[PDB]
Assembly symmetry: C5
Homo-oligomer: 334 residues x 5
């Protein structure tokens, strides 16, 4: 309760305190416990292969140089005192753009304990790279990880562990991804050996399952219906050259128009995906449907009996082949 | 009026003043009163699920260490003196990108009072996350909130309240949102219990009702008219194969062209919305209209009497079914 | 000419100088004169409702504490000395993103005078919010203002005025806006009363008239010509079912294609504009033109004499109605 | 070779050195020589009317206060010593976003000479505004300039000149612009009189000639071919109503589709360009081609002899008028 | 193990240490060894002609002033001590936007050795300019280089070499480029002579081979199929004017629609590419196919025998010419 007495204690601790030396320098490595309180996942971008994450990053360790006695209450110092202490050189291995919020003040917390324990919390919005195998898009399951490592110190100087076991990372249930749904998150602690030596490593991975309801209604359904309309020409009198030619080519034109516009809406990733195969697969059927009439029209004059046979056979072969195409497609990717 | 006397008083207050210790450290929590003067809401983005807000954020508390006597006038110190005082660690829970304007100087105000009262104002442009339930888009009502909390101190160390009751937040009437209209704003004061303890919480929520006039004229009206034109083929002589086939497929082509282009203009949110159901609902009718002629054309030769019956029945069934589709659609989402 | 003597004078002025106290603290308010030398207006964005402005912002006031004698020449100190003086807390009320250029050095000027007069110039590129009433777009006239106010001090502590009267703001004639043309700029000085008290206010407003030549050629002209082509079907033999049906629906398809693509090129503002009414107005005529043939075709067999009467009457009613539509449109918005 | 002796010399020079006073304060103006080593021109944006430039900006002047004796070798001090010296307040008049690279260290060089000469180099990536007269786009020649001026000091206090004459600016030959080709660069030294007095001015201008090969193949060629296909209807039997009507309107539809999509690819500049006139010029011919058939079809029944005369005359008038249109277009803009 | 003894040693080394003087000032140049541990290549943008690179940049040199004795263990000081030492002025010649990550702390490592050796590591995300010769796009092979040079010091003052020979740069095998595949990387050490003198240079170049699977399926395949459908009109009865005219023009319309939409998806680079020639090459065949029918239709009445000869000859000439076009195209660019 005595502010002057507390002020003297803090100045005494900081007097002779060297920030360039880790706790227990030259001795056993300092154990650091880390908890993450995830606030939200802002976006998951397939074009940039990254996801934006906002979280409360806390580090828990003990520094004997900061131990104080006589004050039972835990000291909650101002965030500006963190520049005068020693903090682990924790950094994220796969981040691309990370920053600490500073409104109204820097979102930073320093809390001291009588036994020298230090609690250090940060609110960080980081963009972590996540390579995606989008061959089975949009029926794919992604695994995006956040890697935590010490930049300068080795395992002999510092050790990382998840404070709380599997309960170290919270707030996953509150994440609301419009496109994905979180299935499972895992916590991994391991040591990685590099050229300069072993380093502590902490990993936070998510397995994301993409929602398919939007793509079925917006992408797959229009393509199927246009393919169905291409079969209308089969149930048309062969003498109506204008009707079947116009119907066949317009369906090809309609298929191209939807296919080109979807690509612009879809991510700009330049490699073959599951949706691209299906759309080009349907484009073959409308291409074959128009070619079917050309063969019928050419031989209609010479062999009218055979021409009608091809027209009625196409009424079964095309729906049967298309169903087999869907059966192969919807089992290979599911 | 004596500048030298005032200068001595300020230096005396700052002498022995510790920024690392909150007012009444070790005693009752310091009560902080907060008022918000909203300037404008820059944008409300559905793609990023966030809204940009510009406001004058003011904090009101009392620090006995800064109390001075002999000068009746309230001291309006320079903004650069705020770095030498103690200010609450107020931060916004759901913000994404927030900053304080600094042109020409930092938009910051420090005002002192004889009884130790401190007034601290900031002009902050913050981007706050707002998860949106856009299933009923564009006929949806959104509720975006701004959450205020203390990062480090608990309820035992600091307490938050709205200075002025329901009058704490002003400027809502002056907000001009081109797309939304503000219906109601609420002020909520509560304490939230976390792992580290209870924290003060202040909430500022808005309920936004989206305007529909643009979407009715630009999106719903063109789709209805194209659907109406699909019924023109019913009032066409059945022998005109070229006329009805061309009309039917072009309406399907026209429906696809407008549908694909609207999606690019509409937000890239990948899930089913109210507008998507309506556009795909209308796309079924034009799909059925073309299929209706195919059935009529196939049986026209064998049963001309029955074929004409189907053509005239479609003149009533299709308009009646479409009206029922609108009746269900315009009551479910309204 | 004596550098050592000048160096001693500046140090003497800064000795005992308090930046936390305004000139004549506790006395009459300090009058500040402001001139603006506008360099260019970078952009005027309708989507974001803001305009980017680059200008030379200068402030002119007198501080007796900085008065010096013995040196007739005006002192032009380095820009880094501004951090050691007192400058007004001038800020822009409606700015969104503002910064001071710092290449190669900070674009800042401090000039001292023997009578204590201080000249303070800044080169600022600010993005100021400008709400636009785009109902009459693109035939609208916009009024974008830049508001200048003191953040902390009231009218009792500081007063604002335009140094030079109507000549305070220059460089308006040199502004080259590709889309707009500046018609008139006004300077307004007023005092605004808030909860904390009255504040000085300086306003710089522009009235922008949008150019219409681009929209007439690129948007209005194609729509008119397509509407004219819809009347071609009237001068077509009624027995040619394929010709008139194809012409009617393709014009509807052509009207939709241009209408959808223009919206993407046009700003994403979601409310009804003047151009939207005209494009949807023309879309009705092509919709009615196709409906006109359907009525003629249906009754052509039963009453060929009446069907020809409707076809020839449409050759006059449609051009006359369209001209009246333009006459109403081009007088309501002009 | 004696590091201690060199360290003493530098400290002696900085002792008593005032950064707020220019060299020869109160005397003749200090002459500054400037050389530019252009690295690359990143982009030339027509939408934003600016170009991004990366260069090595060096300033050359003499300060007698920094003169040292006894050390023949030129001193190459660390970049962090520039904050302790006096440097000209050089800034770019027409820049929009400029910065100095700071990886790994700040790209800044300070070099001292025994005679007091100071060399000051910076690596700056600046975005300079360049108003473009794009009426003749894409057959236009642009002139983008970089303006150099002193922010605070007048001609009486500082003078600018190009160190090396016409050889001051190098690296122009190494610039690789994908769209433009540099024709000529000029160096201009002049004094500009403002309200506060005369200022030194250095100008670096480029004259850029736009490449036309891409636009000829991608924009002009498709438009010409579609216009040619519109003349196919002339060599079609007049009795084929379906063939000529479909061909005429589809060419109009094809012309609209390419015209609308090009505008989105082309810059969003809202004023008439050379390409816009040509595309709308070709759109008239296809509009007239369809109108030509309407006149022929209407009078074909009454006067078949005259109708055939118009059809064969259109086979010559349209190609001749189109060639004259190109002859006027390709000479007015070339 | 004695923290106080280590603290005294570091302070002794920093006492009298001058950062403005390079090691062995006035003597032999200081040799700097550099290793790069590439983390990932974020993107390779053809529009901006740059690639984003994330790497661990380490510098290895010896400074005798920092040599210490008595402590066998290598000192791993805090990253904040780097501001108090001397580090090479290493910068990247062709970078555009480069920064050092600073979350949670600045990603910087300083390690000292008893023999005065200093290890200095940085984690840098740099955007390096890479001019691309995209004439053969998308069948092109690109060569993007990262250039390393000393900004201020010449070869007489500093020398650069790759520490580890060809093993200096690692992590290339772990790079996952979705569009490109890394073929070979080279390390080059050379001295470049400029106006101010020779400078050390280190180069890291990559040769990237673009994947073609996406472009074959998405771009080349649709164009070929539409060209094939243009040959359908050859196997159509010549009397069917409506069928062949509609098929010919719609294929031209279909070719234009896909061609225009691909350009928007493709990079905005304004010069002729390999893909542009192929798409315009195919557009000629559909243009010639429609022209072929016009010649046949015109002379069908006068010379029916000759008209049928042209129709059957087109069934061979067009497929043969198209195959030769592909044979020339697929050998010139491969
Ligand atoms: C996304 O993809 C990443 C990989 O790219 C997955 O990460 C892997 O996760 C698994 C767990 O699901 C990890 O496997 C575990 O590794 C632990 C650490 O191993 C280190 O230490 C041991 C010695 O103790 C060494 O042998 C080893 O080489 C490492 O140095 C182990 O301790 C775990 O063992 C436990 O489980 C196994 C069964 O799995 C038991 O047999 C053991 O007895 C013990 O109980 C386990 O092996 C794996 O290391 C991770 N890989 C990487 C690269 O981090 C993510 O899981 C994935 N995302 C999701 C959501 O699954
Ligand atoms: C957007 O959506 C958010 C929710 O996501 C809405 O926020 C809620 O707003 C309501 C008010 O409209 C809040 O309800 C009020 O909470 C107050 C605080 O409760 C705390 O303290 C009490 C004890 O005093 C505890 O029991 C409780 O658990 C909390 O810890 C209460 O004091 C209020 O009670 C008053 O009103 C009720 C009637 O509503 C009376 O019965 C009471 O006697 C008393 O007068 C009230 O319950 C709610 O807490 C808010 N939720 C959140 C999560 O903040 C926004 O309102 C919405 N936007 C709009 C525009 O509506
Ligand atoms: C864009 O839109 C803005 C408004 O949103 C316009 O700004 C207005 O501009 C007009 C002038 O064109 C301003 O009117 C003038 O206000 C001055 C200040 O008034 C204050 O002080 C008086 C007492 O002196 C109080 O009564 C008053 O309430 C204010 O506190 C007056 O001094 C002016 O009076 C002079 O002109 C009038 C005639 O206009 C004479 O009758 C008087 O005798 C005297 O000569 C005048 O009234 C108005 O205040 C501005 N509004 C705002 C909100 O700033 C922009 O002009 C417009 N853009 C363009 C290009 O026009
Ligand atoms: C892009 O567009 C800009 C203009 O917007 C062009 O810049 C102009 O460039 C020309 C040179 O090509 C400049 O003309 C030269 O100006 C020099 C400076 O003039 C100042 O000083 C004189 C007195 O010495 C004053 O009278 C004058 O008012 C100025 O204050 C002159 O010294 C030059 O004279 C020399 O050449 C002329 C012939 O051109 C001879 O007759 C003379 O004897 C002498 O040898 C000359 O007049 C012009 O000033 C520039 N304008 C601006 C605004 O900077 C760029 O050139 C253009 N880009 C390209 C690539 O051309
Ligand atoms: C992307 O494109 C760049 C060029 O734009 C390529 O970079 C070139 O790479 C080659 C190697 O593949 C470099 O050639 C080598 O240069 C070394 C340095 O030369 C300097 O020093 C010598 C004297 O020692 C001077 O004569 C010379 O002028 C330079 O000042 C040489 O030491 C190398 O010689 C070795 O190899 C050759 C055979 O190649 C042997 O004959 C020699 O005996 C010796 O073993 C060699 O000549 C070239 O300098 C680079 N150019 C630039 C501008 O950097 C990239 O390689 C390319 N990307 C890929 C993936 O290939
Ligand atoms: C606080 O401690 C100081 C120093 O021992 C002492 O003088 C003062 O009386 C104490 N105050 C209280 C309230 O204990
Ligand atoms: C201001 O206070 C000082 C110190 O007491 C005194 O010397 C001076 O005369 C005072 N001036 C006025 C105007 O009261
Ligand atoms: C400048 O002033 C100093 C201090 O009075 C004096 O010693 C010196 O001689 C003066 N120099 C000149 C040139 O007047
Ligand atoms: C460097 O100069 C100092 C000071 O004069 C002297 O003591 C020392 O011996 C000199 N060293 C050399 C190598 O000249
Ligand atoms: C560390 O060194 C100091 C200074 O010599 C000495 O007083 C102290 O006893 C030493 N401690 C240990 C553990 O060696």
């Amino acid at each position: 309760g005595n502010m002057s007495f507390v002020k003297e204690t803090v100045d005494k601790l900081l007097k002779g305190y060297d920030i360039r030396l880790r706790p227990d320098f030259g001795g056993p490595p300092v154990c650091v416990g880390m908890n993450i309180d995830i606030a939200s996942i802002d976006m998951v971008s397939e074009v940039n292969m990254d996801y934006t994450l906002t979280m409360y990053f806390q580090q828990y360790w003990r520094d004997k140089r900061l131990a104080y006695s006589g004050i039972p209450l835990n000291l909650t110092l101002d965030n500006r005192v963190a520049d005068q202490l020693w903090v682990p050189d924790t950094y994220f291995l796969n981040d691309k753009k990370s920053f600490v919020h500073g409104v109204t003040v820097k979102n930073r917390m320093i809390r001291l304990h009588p036994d020298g324990t230090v609690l250090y919390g940060l609110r960080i919005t980081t963009t972590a790279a996540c390579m995606m195998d989008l061959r089975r898009y949009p029926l794919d399951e992604q695994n995006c990880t956040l890697e935590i490592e010490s930049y300068g110190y080795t395992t002999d100087d510092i050790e990382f562990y998840w404070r709380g076991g599997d309960k170290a990372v919270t707030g996953v249930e509150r994440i609301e991804l419009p496109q994905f749904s979180i299935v499972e998150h895992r916590l991994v602690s391991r040591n990685v050996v590099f050229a300069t030596g072993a380093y502590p490593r902490l990993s936070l991975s998510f397995r994301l399952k993409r929602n398919i309801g939007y793509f079925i209604l917006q992408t797959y359904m229009p393509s199927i219906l246009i393919t169905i309309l291409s079969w209308v020409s089969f149930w048309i009198n062969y003498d109506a050259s204008a009707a079947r030619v116009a119907l066949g080519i317009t369906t090809v034109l309609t298929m191209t128009t939807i296919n080109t516009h979807l690509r612009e809406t879809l991510p700009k990733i330049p490699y073959v995906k599951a949706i691209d195969m299906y759309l080009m697969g349907c484009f073959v059927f409308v291409f074959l449907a128009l070619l079917e009439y050309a063969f019928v029209n050419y031989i209609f004059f010479s062999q009218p009996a055979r021409a009608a046979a091809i027209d009625r056979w196409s009424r079964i072969v095309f729906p049967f082949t298309f169903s087999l195409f869907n059966l192969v497609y919807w089992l290979y990717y599911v």
